Amino acid sequence: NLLSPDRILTVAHRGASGYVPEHTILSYETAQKMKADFIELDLQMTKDGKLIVMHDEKLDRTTNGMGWVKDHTLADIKKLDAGSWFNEAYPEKAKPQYVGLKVPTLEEVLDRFGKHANYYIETKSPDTYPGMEEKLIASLQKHKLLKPGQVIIQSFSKESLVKVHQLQPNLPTVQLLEAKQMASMTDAALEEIKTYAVGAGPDYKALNQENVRMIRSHGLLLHPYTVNNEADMHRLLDWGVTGVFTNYPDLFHKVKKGY
Ligand SMILES: O=P(O)(O)OC[C@H](O)CO
Ligand SMILES: [Ca+2]
Ligand code: NA
Structure with a gap:
């Protein structure tokens, strides 16, 4: 269920690190209260x-x-x-x-x-x-x-x-995946990722509709990092990502309701 391609996951990047110091119990507690699916x-x-x-x-x-x-x-x-x-x-x-x-x-x-x-x-x-x-x-x-x-x-x-x-x-x-890794991504590289991994986590700056659909075509989950801007959240979900790493888990929780 958590690993279902049709489920959009909120991953709280170092906890609710947009509001609380990263990687503290308080940051994780806050992410929990903000209904994050995962603490990172x-x-x-x-x-x-x-x-x-x-x-x-x-x-x-x-x-x-x-x-x-x-x-x-x-x-x-x-x-x-x-x-x-x-x-x-x-x-x-x-x-x-x-x-x-x-x-x-x-x-x-x-x-x-x-x-x-x-x-x-x-x-x-x-x-x-x-x-x-x-x-x-x-x-x-x-x-x-x-x-x-x-x-x-x-x-x-x-x-x-x-x-x-x-x-x-x-x-x-x-x-x-780093930005330049994602930039030069191939189908061959994605298919072998699938052999040990259930998903890919690329720098969101390197994503476009094309390589998003490509990643999804291999049955891979897709969680770009680090997505903090509401406008980017919408764009990435319309393109077809299946979650994000975010410093603002409450904001992404709100946005993803439309997808
Ligand atoms: O936080 P960064 O910049 O190291 O990017 C990786 C994210 O934490 C996802 O693991
Ligand atoms: Ca990390
Ligand atoms: Na210091």
Whole structure:
């Protein structure tokens, strides 16, 4: 049902990150309240091997810390402020309750929502953080998450998704595509994506009616990122995408009602 081509999915990009600091429990809670179908997680691995949720490989942008995630322990990362950066970046959206928000672990996110959320979880190329895929899988099993569609695994790395498809054939994967990858996409490339992935997630800027219909022609779900503008939401849905990654899940929830 969640994986039905005829279902339009709201994927809350790093949670309700248009309103709340990205990849915090509060961002995910807000996305839930806004009726997002999926909350979206990016994984990094700490020095002591723990999976945390963070978009960048470095702490710099979204915390009061500095340096690579993999050079720091979980304990030190849990001391950081992962909310104040948002108040500084977006003064007009700032809220006092964002000061002191924490970096969550994957464990903390699964524990917080259990089966009450659907998870859209990004892995890296296998060489980046050895053991990440296996640890992710074991965490999903711990929380009894492995309803097909309860969890989708996404990556820019084909190798990662191929590996995941090997280990857990019934675990839906989505191939992420950069703009220039999508720009030069072929039918040959799409048909093999279908062999391990249930969908494609391209930079929406690279989409047009033609390659949208082409992607859909291979029975692939289609979730472009990152779609924040109402005018773009409408255009992409009329073209035939089956969902979006958005920072504004309430807005997309409203728009998609007409499609
Ligand atoms: O957020 P970006 O810019 O890394 O684009 C990928 C989206 O998160 C979809 O995974
Ligand atoms: Ca992502
Ligand atoms: Na900072």
